[PDB]
Amino acid sequence: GSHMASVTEQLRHCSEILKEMLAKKHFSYAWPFYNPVDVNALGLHNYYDVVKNPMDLGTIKEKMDNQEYKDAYKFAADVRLMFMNCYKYNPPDHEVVTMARMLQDVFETHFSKIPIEP
Ligand SMILES: CNC(=O)c1ccc(C(=O)Nc2cc(NC(=O)c3ccc4c(c3)c(-c3ccc(N)cc3C)nn4C)ccc2C)cc1
């Protein structure tokens, strides 16, 4: 009751974080993560044998909208899964790895400041 009000309010902060990562200020490094990776358009070999749980910001926003996250920790897991998929598949100095780490710095710095009860 009381506890649920706090959990839902954290997921509201997660909504604010998601909208921040979708803001035009981050577009130059966030755009590869807006939608599912277009494996066919980029000619990516064996993507679905390296990355078994694909995740992107669009799917996260759909899960948010369906109210699919039970709490903020599971929201964070998906964001972090999305970034980890990109570290797993691409060469460590690839340009999208640099982009993943820049967008991830935005997520991690904001997520770390969500209060325990609010
Ligand atoms: C057992 N099998 C294996 O172990 C294995 C098999 C094959 C590969 C293999 O081919 N890696 C590989 C990937 C790239 N990457 C690209 O060329 C590129 C270009 C543009 C992109 C992207 C990627 C993405 C993107 C793709 C995936 C994710 N998750 C997130 C994002 C953001 N987005 N955009 C715009 C280049 C070279 C190599 C060798 C590695 C290991």
Residue numbers in the entry: 262 to 379
Paper text:
BRDT is a tissue-restricted BET subfamily member expressed in pachytene spermatocytes, diplotene spermatocytes, and round spermatids. Based on proof-of-principle knockout and in vivo chemical biology studies, BRDT is a validated germ cell target for small-molecule contraceptives. Deletions of either BD1 or both BD1 and BD2 in the mouse BRDT gene result in male sterility, indicating that BRDT is a testis-specific target for male contraception. Our drug discovery campaign on BRDT, a validated spermatogenic-specific contraceptive target, yielded rapid discovery of potent and specific inhibitors of the second bromodomain of BRDT that have unique binding characteristics to BRDT-BD2 relative to BRDT-BD1.
CDD-1102 was identified as a potent, BD2 versus BD1 selective compound with enhanced metabolic stability over other compounds. The overall structure of two molecules in the BRDT-BD2/CDD-1102 crystal was similar, with one CDD-1102 bound at each acetylated lysine (KAc) binding pocket (showing an rmsd of 0.25 Å between shared 97 CA atoms). CDD-1102 binds to the extended pocket consisting of the KAc binding pocket, ZA channel, WPF shelf, and a channel formed between ZA and BC loops. Specifically, the aniline nitrogen interacts with the side chain of Y308 in the ZA loop, whereas the two internal amide nitrogens form hydrogen bonds with the backbone carbonyl of Y350 and the side chain of N351 at the BC loop. The aniline ring binds deep into a hydrophobic pocket consisting of nonpolar residues from the ZA loop (V298) and B and C helices (Y308 and C347). The indazole ring docks to the WPF shelf (W292, P293, F294), the ZA (V298, L303, and L305) and the BC (H355) loops, and the C helix (V357). The following m-phenylenediamine ring is partially accessible to solvent and docks to the channel formed between the ZA (H306 and V311) and BC (Y350, P352, and H355) loops though hydrophobic contacts. The terminal amide does not provide any hydrogen bonding interactions, and the terephthalamide ring docks to a shallow hydrophobic surface consisting of N307 and V311 side chains at the ZA loop. The backbone carbonyl oxygen atoms of P293 and M343 form hydrogen bonds with the aniline and indazole nitrogens through ordered waters.
